[PDB]
Amino acid sequence: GSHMCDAFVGTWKLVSSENFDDYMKEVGVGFATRKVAGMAKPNMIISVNGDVITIKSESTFKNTEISFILGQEFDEVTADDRKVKSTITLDGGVLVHVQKWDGKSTTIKRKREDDKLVVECVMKGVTSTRVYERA
Numbered sequence: 001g002s003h004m005c006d007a008f009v010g011t012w013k014l015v016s017s018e019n020f021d022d023y024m025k026e027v028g029v030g031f032a033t034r035k036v037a038g039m040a041k042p043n044m045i046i047s048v049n050g051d052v053i054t055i056k057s058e059s060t061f062k063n064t065e066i067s068f069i070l071g072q073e074f075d076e077v078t079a080d081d082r083k084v085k086s087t088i089t090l091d092g093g094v095l096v097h098v099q100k101w102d103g104k105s106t107t108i109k110r111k112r113e114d115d116k117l118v119v120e121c122v123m124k125g126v127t128s129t130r131v132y133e134r135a
């Protein structure tokens with residue numbers, strides 16, 4: 001079939017987090033923004049419309065939103081308000097999302113396992129891991 005939609009679409013609520021503070025520090029996020037973002041526990045809404053995929057994150061603190069095609073690079077404004085250039089691909093059924101800015105790079109992987117959606121953020125060997133369930 002064409003199973004990528006059925007795997008990822010829906011509304012996901014955070015249920016665990018590792019070293020997110022550390023990840024945000026390494027990306028350069030300010031100390032107050034880090035803490036408040038860490039407490040926000042935002043939902044992640046994934047949707048599909050033909051070739052165009054969208055990932056919304058919603059909290060009382062801040063909303064964000066990206067729409068993209070796989071393989072196409074696009075400008076993105078991140079939750080801490082960095083301007084970045086992003087490319088998202090489907091590699092072995094995982095969504096792999098790369099962010100380039102000022103000669104740096106961070107990678108965000110989103111992978112389904114069982115009833116869960118696991119997100120891994122890497123920045124120069126600081127690694128954060130967050131788990132989500134359907135809400």
Ligand SMILES: O=c1c(C/C=C/c2ccccc2)c(O)ccn1Cc1ccc(Cl)cc1Cl
Nearest residue numbers: 029037040042057059062078079080119121
């Ligand atoms: O963008 C995301 C999201 C999606 C929403 C996050 C998000 C977090 C808090 C509030 C709203 C949205 C994740 O699950 C995990 C990582 N990142 C990267 C990131 C996350 C946070 C910050 Cl500050 C900076 C950066 Cl580069």
